[PDB]
Structures are given as C-alpha cells and as structure tokens.
A paper describes a structure:
In this study, we identified the function of LpSOGP, determined its crystal structure, which is the first one among phosphorylases acting on β-linked glucan, and clarified the binding modes of substrates. In addition, LpSOGP did not show phosphorolytic activity toward cellobiose or laminaribiose. These results indicate that LpSOGP is highly specific to SopNs, as LiSOGP is, and is completely different from other GH94 enzymes in substrate specificity. The tertiary structure consists of four domains: two N-terminal β-sandwich domains (residues 1–257, yellow, Ndom1; and 295–553, light blue, Ndom2), a catalytic (α/α)6 barrel domain (593–1020, green), and a β sheet domain (magenta). Ndom1 is unique to LpSOGP, being missing in CBP, ChBP, and CBAP.
The crystal structure of apo LpSOGP was determined at 2.0 Å resolution. The crystals contain two identical molecules in an asymmetric unit. The two molecules in the asymmetric unit are in contact with each other mostly in the Ndom1 region. The contact area is only 2.5% (935.5 Å2) of the monomer surface area. The overall structure of LpSOGP besides Ndom1 is basically similar to those of GH94 CBAP from Saccharophagus degradans (SdCBAP), ChBP from Vibrio proteolyticus (VpChBP), and CBP from Cellvibrio gilvus (CgCBP) (the RMSD values are 4.11, 3.53, and 3.29 Å, respectively). As for the substrate recognition region, two helices (α1 and α2) in Ndom1 constitute a part of the catalytic pocket as well as in Ndoms in VpChBP and CgCBP. Ndom1 appears to be generated through domain duplication according to its position and the structural similarity to Ndom2. This duplication monomerizes LpSOGP but retains the fundamental constitution of a catalytic pocket between hetero domains.
Residue numbers in the entry: 1 to 1113
C-alpha cells in the first residue's frame, strides 16, 4: 500500500507569489519569490496559527469569533488570486476577501453587516520570513533574528520586520498594517497573543483584553493588531495588508512603499470566483485538559516526595526516590518553554553506537515526536515537535478520547512524571484517572505507548500519527503494509533515506480491534485531505498499547507478548548507575542541600549528555543529527574520560580523525557520523585544536599511545566521501599542526582568528577581521593544546614533540608580548602590522561600550598559562565586571545592535532576541569558569558557581531567576529584556539582580557532560590517569563528613571527606588508618593533590574500601 502525500488544494498565484491554503482556508505555505512568509504550515485538524477575530462587547459578556480558516465554519469561493470567506457570527454577517496581488502585497478585506453596539477586530499572523528550508528547520531560531520596528501610519500601528540573518544572501522584509480603520494596539510575539494559559485553555489569552503594544523579541514571531472599537448599524468595510520584500539591506527607519501599497490596493482579479467544498469536522470537540490535582490527590499518587518546589503554597514540581521528576500542571502554566523529554535506547558503551532509537515527548499531550532509528533527521517515522505553546498540536503521536458526544484531544495533564526510561501523563477525568505512558525498551529498538484507565472504565479513542518515513512530513509517499495487528512502514524510492539505508523500515503493533484510516474519519463527508495522517480508532477499551519498532538495517525482530514498563525502568536504572560509576553522596546527619541536588541531577545530566553524544538533538534544537567537531571533543569525551569509558573514547577518536578533511587538513564544523555523507567543510578557527586536545587527554588518561598508529582515512571537502588514502593518526596530527603554523600573523606567533572562535555568534563580519584579528582565547587554547600534544607524543616521536614544545613557547610568548596591557588580557587584538595594532574588548578601547571578555581569563587559568599574579587579576576582573547572581557573563556589555546590520561580529549584532549567547550567560562558559576556580583551588566560589546553574530549586538559590524545568540542562540565562536597546540601556540590572532572568534552550549541549566532569574530576577530585588515580579535591567545609560512593577501576569505593585547614600537609589519604603513598601533583596556583598507583590503591581497597581524604582547603 502506498500512502499519498498532502498537497494544499487551494493554490493562489500571482506573478512571483504562490500562497497555498488547506480546504478550510487555513494557511499552508505563503511563498513570495523564494521567501516563506508564514512561520507554521496549517494542518487538516487544527487549521493554521493565523486568523482574524471579530469580538462583540456586551453589558455582561465579551465574545470572540474566528472569521477565517476551518474553525470559522465560513463558506469559501476561490479565484486564481482571490479567496472569499462568508458567514455569520451571532447576528453579524461577514465577508472576508483575501487578495493576492502581483506586487508581493496581499489584503484581507473585511466587510461586516448588521447591528451591534460595540465590536472590534483582531488581526493575527505568525511570520517566518526566511527560506522554506530555514523556517522548517527551526522556527525559533529564525524568529530570534527577525527584528521588528513599530510606527504610526495613517491608520495607527504598522509593523515592519527585517530578517537579519542572511537568507540566500538576501535580507527579507515584511510590513503589516490596516487600511480604513485605526490599529490602536499591537503585539509581536506568540507569547503575547496566545499566552502561557493557552496551553491549558486552548484560547488565545489576548482575546479577553487589549494587546500590550510592546514589541517582545522572542521565538514566536507573531504579529497582532487590534482595531478601534466601532458600532454597526448597516455595513462597514476595512482591510489589513501585508507587504513582502525579498531584500531590504538597509535597517528599517520608517514606513516604506506607500505608493506601491496604494496601487496594490486597487488590484482585483478579472476571473470568476467560484464556490469550493469545505469538509467539516464531525463530533470533534475542543481539546481536553485535565483539572488540577489538590494536595490530597498529589499525596495519594506521590506519597514520597523530595526537593519540593512550591510557589504561593502550590506544589509545582518534585523528585521521587525512584529517580523520577514530577511536574504539576500549574508549573507548565508558568514556564515559557514547555516541559519535555527525550527517550533513548541503551547501547554498548564500549563502541560508538549506530541505530540508536529515540523519541521526544512533552507534558501538553505530545506523546511521541520524532521517532528515529539512528540519524535523527533522516531515519524518522514521526514528525518533529515545533513551536512552544502547542497551537499546532498535530505532530507525532496524539490522542483523542470521546467525552460525551465528541472526540476531544488530550492536552495538559494534572501531572507529568519523567524517568530516564519513560514519561507518564496523569489525566483527571470525571471520576477516573487516565494514565498514559510512553517508554523505551531495554535491549530492543522500541518505544511503547500504553494507555490505562485507573478505574477500568471503557472509552473510545483515536490515536493519530503524523508520519514522515523520511526527514519531513508532506514530502514523499510512504509504503505501508499490514499483516493482522502488525504495520510495516518504509520509504518510497525518491526519499534520500532510501538511498543510504535501503533496508530501513518501521513497524507498529496496533490493538486487535481497531480500525485504520487517515484524517477522513474526522470529517462529516469522509474526505481524506492528509493521506499520511495514520489514525487508529479504538472503541470501548479500558486499556491498550501501541508498540513502535525501528530497523535501520532491516534486522526485524518479533514483538514480545508482554511490554512491561517496570522491568525497563529497573534495567535503565542500573545502566545509568553504571554510566556514572555508582555516584552517590551520603552523610550520617542530614546531607547538605548541594549534595542532595547533585544526587538528584547527576543521572539527568548523564542522560542529556548521552543524548548529545549518541542521538544528537534537543528540545528546541530538534535538527541536529551530526556531531559538532568541537562539541564531541568536549561533552562526550570529558564525560567518558571522567567515568572511565576509555574504549568508547578511543573509538570516538578514531571516528573523529576519519572525518578530517583532505587537502585543507582541518575538520569540518560538524559531520554526520553514520552512513550519510554530509558535513560543513567551512569551520571556525578554534575547531582544529579540539581533536588534538582530546587525543592528548585520552593518551594521558590511559597511556594508550597505540591510537597514534591507527590507519585512518580522510574525507573530501565538497562531497564528504572517504578518500581511501589512509594515513596514521600521528600523520593526521602533523598535517593539522601544519595548518596551525600557517595561521601565524607575520612576524609573530599570534594565531589568526580565521572563521572565529568558540562563540559561534562572534564570526568576523569581513575578510580583514578574519586575517588580522587575534582571539586571546584561541591563542590560549592553542598553547594549552600544543603543550598537551607535546607530552602525549614525547615517548613516540622525539623530534615532533620538540617542535610542539617550541611552537607552544612561541605562542605563549606572543600571548604575553601582545595580548596583555595594564595587567588585563584583551579579548582581541586587531593587527595590520607592528605599526598598526589595536585592542578590542579591553579597557583601552575607549570608543567601545565593551571592555572585558570572560573566555581568555578562564582559559589562561585552566591551561596554567596565566602566571599566579595575572590569574589573580583575572579573578578580580571577573568579580568586578562579569559576575552576576545568575552566573558569570561573557563580556561586560552587550554586542552592538543598530537595527540588525553587522560591523565587527555577525550573529551577535544580528540577533533581535536577547537569548542564547547574546544573553552573555551561556552556561557552558560558566562551567569553564568553575574549571578555572577548581584549578586555583577556590572551593567556596567554585561550589557557589556550581549551584548558580543547577536547575533544582534554582529560584531559591538565585532570587531573580524564573523557574524552569528542573531535570534538564538549560543552555543560557537571559534577562527579561524585550529588545536589544533596552538590554544595552539597562544591562547593569543583571549585575545587581534587579531584572528577572529566564532559561534558554534545553538539553542538547556539551554543558551536561562538562558539568559532570567538574563535579567528579575537579571538585570532588577523583581523576584517572595511566595506572594511577589522582585525588585532588576542591571542597568546602560543608563536605566535611560527607562520603562519595564511586567505582574506580571497576571497584566500588567510598571516599569520605575531612576538611581540616589546620593540617601540615595539603592532603592525606588513609584506608584502615594506613596512609596511601603517592606523589604530589603539579599546580602553579596552589598545593596540588596526590597521585596514587593503581595497584597500591586497589590493594588497599580490597582490604578496606572506605578511603578517608584529609584535605586543607
Ligand atoms: Ca559534616
């Protein structure tokens, strides 16, 4: 069987514009030249995100009615460039006329007829303003670069928007406004129009009041306009309009195109405008959200609760002894970003895995999005989650339940419980609880949905599935066959998947008594519209399940007879315990809260890190799939080195070196690590150092110099294919080091900035910046890396090792010679020649508002490159200029913003949204601050810094932080500033905590893996070396008497901390009162810890496994 693909049946065309609509008149794709104007495509059940609303005001009520789309119940006629909606709302007759002109200009002409005392209209339009590929790839990211300017025109507010991130080399533009009626209020973001409360009510919050008339630059670009209120006694007519320009290189300064708009407004189509049939939903009600639970209910279902978060006495979230995190309904209605989770199948932790199965889900009834096997972009069964507020609620697997006469879609539950193995939703119904579970199977490529009525009451259900079978919905036909209760789905020939994973298929085991259809069952006349919405109707059951299987290589296995969550939960618990070497902090008295938070979060961060590594995608950042070259070298390698997964790291490193690029001999920015030959051959200037640093760290930890002799291929730049001309890794390293020599600025060993550094928003805006900038951070990283490489290679290739020592010395010399003035390391040097040099991000740059950069200050400490006196100064600088209650910031003032055009840095000057790196508290960099503090032995600061970015009970620790999902990593902390100008003007509020801050994108980051390393390796001080253990704690008095359980060289040991500032020596380690012999570690800033031989350590542990660590902090 072949499932057809959805094509929008209403197609309007004019000149260079094609605007398509679904049969109810919902926007599908609005394209002008090569720019997509809407942000979200409509779907056949929800409609689209845009609308026009008529509101009617009475003495005892306010009412609101959509005039367009499938929910208006409007009749429709179309022409070649015109669409006419007709209907009535209460006693008012309306017609809406959509006109697409030849001028990249459209109109919504509204005519109202009847009698009423007071009414208004609200125009509502979600906007993308990018290429189709950019919009579909990440609407959130696109919106961050869409800068809005607000003006007063002839008819009140007009909204002009410029896309600041280049789209096919163009900077596209929109203008929206009203004609013939005043727009007296406006808004620009979805969170302002729909509100968080939508996630429960399904009603846009703005419809009960007046728009705020503020421009919020966030991630849901969404234009709304509210008309003046009016009376009707007869017929009244007015319009909204839009203008799209594909290229607007200047910044916006005023309302433009006034003459074109006037001409366009006179345009009408000559053709006949004829009726079309509108399929209508039948017995489908509004969505169903659970009622909230009270205290007794919560206590009954969750009698054992830890780390409880309460606001105004309402419980918002908590953790359980079974290592779950539970979120109550009220918390979702306060968090701007939706609570969610990623499930992933276990794999063999000695090798880089392939074919890992993953699924995503969210609290508001998205039970299974983006089901994948291996590649998270291409090897996909179910569509990706999009947006934030679940206005479009079709993606993946969704559930309708019949309540009264109507099927109603499940949305927001009373509670949502997450475990590394699965998610559970609790919906309170009238005298029953429906429990929905979505969970991963252990040792099998499967995700399981289970539905169960707690009272064993029967219901009717429809479970919908937005299939892709390939990278995207609505792109290609799908093969579907059935044998009994088993469905098999596989891609048709044109799909890219089909080419590199020709045996890829999925299977679903469905319930015995169900019926299968597409969306036809939702409609009064049974018309199929979307043929790839796979709908399963299940009648009168009190429970059922759906089991999903993924096979990238065709290794089809039978279904089990029984699918039990509890057994998977126990097996995943053990798997994660082993991953973190049975980490557990304990004390005889009450454990300190910081230890309690670590015990609660560590497996969550291990799960996040494991996803980042093996199935790369996030909640917001659903498009990943590849390894970032610098990223795999950080989060995953640091996590695995910390925990002793050395075989895994070796394989990672071999894989990584095989992706080095022939001819250039640097690495791509990112690459697929599976059979898809896809990479980004253009890279930042820091990227080349990471694989060099990582191999060195591995060699130092393990002694495994054999890796250097492995024969490994390269990849071609344009094609990403193997060259089949392998060389030893040692020679890979030599070629990479040659590229580094070639970066020297003439007469120096200063490394040119080239494509940029760690901060992806700081790409140079022109070629001269590319050649003549030097990043002090890059310079420092280069010194660190070449020294590590020197040591790693010393016993293998004497000469190469000597040359690395000299290069490192030269680089170190240039760092001290050029990049430091008045004791302050400059962020950058701009050098045309010895005669023409200037600092940036240094106090000497008196023309700039930016005088200090974090990165060089931490990197120079971590590398032990900064001498003691300089390092001390770096810390004073951080404290005075960079330290905030929500963490340390990246620079002491924001980057330039002047309407979206770049002068020095690219994305930093283009982002209209205060978020991500632009927030200046990008949590990954704060984690490196912690690594620097640990290097200096500064325990009080280091532990305080660890807690400032720990999501558990964050709002109690950082009083100006807004609450966020407590069991997942957050990537950034951003002040609640509506735009870049207010951010620059009141930046100092961040220092003092006089503005609230909120969390950024979730889960997918190097952050979790590196945080884990800070905890274990740098603070608790347990590190592994070649046949040695290093014990080097940086702990506060609070850890006195606390014990760590940790598995070392396969043996579980217990490390008890005694913190004694009066001791003679810096550290002493005892077991059964015997002092362990060892040698002192090297550290230029403080007394180092101790290195103990593996055999001595293990021999001691066999006798008595409780090691006592006496340390003077
Ligand atoms: Ca104590």
């Amino acid at each position: 069987g072949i499932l057809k693909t959805l094509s929008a049946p209403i197609i309007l065309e004019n000149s260079n514009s094609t605007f398509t609509f679904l049969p109810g008149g919902d926007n599908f794709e609005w394209i002008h030249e090569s720019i997509m104007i809407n942000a979200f495509q409509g779907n056949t059940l929800d409609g689209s995100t845009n609308n026009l609303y008529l509101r009617i005001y009475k003495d005892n009520s306010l009412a609101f009615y959509p005039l367009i789309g499938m929910n208006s119940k409007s009749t429709i006629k179309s022409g070649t460039s015109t669409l006419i909606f007709e209907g009535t709302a209460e006693d008012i007759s309306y017609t809406v006329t959509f006109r697409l002109t030849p001028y990249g200009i459209w109109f919504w002409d509204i005519s109202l007829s009847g009698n009423c005392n007071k009414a208004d209209i609200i125009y509502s339009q979600d906007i993308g303003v990018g290429t189709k590929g950019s919009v579909n790839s990440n609407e959130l990211y696109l919106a961050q670069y869409l800068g809005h300017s607000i003006f007063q025109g002839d008819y009140g507010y007009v909204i002009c928007s410029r896309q600041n991130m280049a789209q096919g080399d163009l900077f596209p533009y929109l203008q929206q406004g009203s004609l013939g009626i005043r727009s007296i209020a406006y808004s620009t973001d979805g969170t302002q129009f729909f509100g968080l409360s939508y996630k429960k009510t399904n009603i846009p919050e703005a419809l009960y009041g007046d728009l705020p008339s503020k421009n919020k630059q966030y991630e849901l670009a969404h234009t709304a306009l509210q008309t003046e209120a009016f009376s009707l006694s007869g017929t009244k007519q007015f319009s909204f309009y839009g203008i799209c320009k594909t290229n607007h290189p200047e910044v916006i300064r005023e309302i433009e195109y006034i003459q074109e708009l006037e001409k366009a407004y006179a345009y009408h189509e000559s053709g006949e405008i004829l009726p079309v049939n509108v399929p209508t939903l039948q017995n489908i009600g509004a969505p169903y959200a659970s009622s909230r639970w009270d205290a007794k209910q919560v206590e009954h279902y969750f009698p054992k609760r830890l780390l409880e978060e309460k606001e105004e006495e309402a419980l918002l979230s908590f953790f359980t002894p079974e290592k779950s995190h539970v979120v109550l309904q009220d918390k979702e209605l306060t968090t701007e970003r939706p609570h969610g989770h990623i499930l992933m199948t276990n794999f063999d932790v000695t090798k880089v895995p392939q074919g890992v199965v993953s699924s995503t889900n969210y609290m508001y009834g998205a039970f299974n999005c983006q089901f994948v096997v291996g590649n998270t972009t291409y090897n996909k069964l179910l569509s990706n989650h999009r947006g934030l507020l679940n206005i479009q609620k079709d993606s993946g697997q969704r559930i309708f339940i019949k309540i009264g006469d109507c099927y109603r879609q499940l949305t927001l539950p009373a509670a949502y419980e997450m475990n590394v193995a699965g998610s559970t939703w609790y919906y309170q119904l009238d005298e029953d609880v429906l429990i929905i579970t979505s969970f991963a199977m252990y040792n099998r490529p499967e995700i399981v949905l289970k539905v169960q009525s707690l009272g064993h009451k029967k219901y009717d259900f429809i479970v919908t599935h937005q299939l892709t079978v390939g990278p995207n919905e609505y792109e290609n036909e799908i093969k579907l066959t059935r044998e009994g209760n088993i469905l098999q789905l596989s891609p048709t020939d044109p799909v890219v998947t089909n080419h590199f994973y020709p045996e890829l298929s999925f299977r679903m085991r469905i319930p015995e008594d169900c019926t299968l259809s597409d969306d036809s069952i939702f409609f009064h006349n049974n018309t199929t519209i979307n043929p790839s919405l796979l709908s399963i109707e299940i009648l009168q059951k009190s429970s059922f399940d759906i089991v999903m299987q993924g096979f990238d290589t065709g290794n089809v296995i039978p279904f089990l007879d029984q699918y039990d969550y509890k057994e998977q939960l126990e097996a995943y618990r053990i798997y994660y315990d082993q991953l973190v070497c049975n980490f557990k902090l304990s004390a005889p008295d009450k454990i300190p809260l910081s230890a309690e938070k670590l015990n609660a979060i560590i497996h969550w961060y291990a799960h996040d890190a494991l996803i980042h590594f093996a199935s790369p995608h996030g909640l917001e950042q659903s498009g990943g799939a590849a390894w970032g070259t610098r990223d795999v070298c950080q989060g995953p390698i640091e996590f695995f080195l910390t925990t002793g997964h050395f075989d895994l790291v070796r394989h990672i490193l071999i894989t990584l070196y095989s992706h080095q690029i022939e001819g250039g001999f640097e690495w791509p920015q990112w690459f697929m690590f599976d059979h898809y030959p896809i990479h980004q051959e253009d890279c930042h200037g820091d990227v080349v150092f990471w694989p060099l640093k990582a191999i060195s760290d591995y060699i130092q930890a393990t002694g495994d110099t054999s890796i250097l002799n492995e024969l490994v291929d390269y990849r071609t730049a344009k094609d990403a294919l193997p060259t089949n001309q392998p060389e030893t890794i040692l020679i890979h390293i030599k070629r990479a080091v040659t590229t580094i020599k070639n970066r020297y600025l003439s007469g120096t060993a200063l490394i040119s900035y080239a494509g940029g550094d760690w901060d992806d928003t700081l790409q140079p805006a022109n070629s001269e910046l590319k050649e003549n900038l030097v990043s002090a951070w890059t310079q420092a990283l280069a010194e660190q890396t070449l020294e590590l490489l020197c040591s790693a290679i010393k016993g293998i290739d004497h000469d190469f090792s000597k040359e690395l020592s000299h290069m490192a010395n030269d680089i170190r010399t240039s760092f001290y010679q050029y990049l430091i003035k008045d004791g302050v390391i400059a962020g950058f040097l701009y050098r045309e020649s010895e005669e023409h040099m200037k600092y940036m991000l240094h106090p000497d740059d008196t023309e700039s508002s930016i005088h200090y950069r974090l990165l060089p200050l931490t990197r120079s400490i971590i590398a032990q490159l900064a001498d003691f006196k300089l390092a001390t100064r770096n810390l004073e600088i951080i404290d005075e200029h960079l330290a905030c209650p929500d963490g340390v910031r990246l620079m002491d003032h924001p980057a330039s913003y002047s309407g979206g055009i770049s002068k020095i840095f690219l994305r930093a000057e283009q982002a209209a949204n205060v978020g991500r790196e632009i927030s200046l508290q990008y949590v990954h960099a704060h984690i490196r601050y912690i690594e620097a503090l640990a290097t200096m032995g500064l325990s009080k600061k280091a532990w305080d810094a660890l807690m400032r970015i720990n999501p558990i009970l964050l709002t109690d620790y950082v009083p100006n932080a807004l609450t966020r999902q407590s069991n997942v990593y957050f990537s950034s902390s951003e002040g609640c500033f509506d735009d870049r100008y207010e951010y620059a003007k009141n930046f100092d509020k961040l220092r003092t905590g006089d503005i609230n801050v909120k969390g950024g994108w979730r889960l997918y980051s190097s952050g979790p893996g590196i945080y884990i390393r800070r905890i274990i390796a740098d603070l608790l001080g347990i590190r592994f070396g070649h046949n040695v253990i290093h014990i080097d704690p940086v702990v506060t008095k609070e850890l006195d008497g606390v014990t760590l359980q940790f598995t070392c060289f396969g043996k579980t040991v217990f490390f008890t901390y005694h913190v004694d500032d009066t001791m003679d020596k810096h550290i002493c380690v005892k077991s059964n009162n015997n002092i362990l012999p060892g040698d002192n570690l090297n550290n230029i800033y403080r007394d180092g810890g101790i290195q103990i031989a593996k055999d001595v350590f293990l021999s001691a542990a066999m006798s008595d496994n409780n090691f006592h660590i006496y340390v003077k902090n």
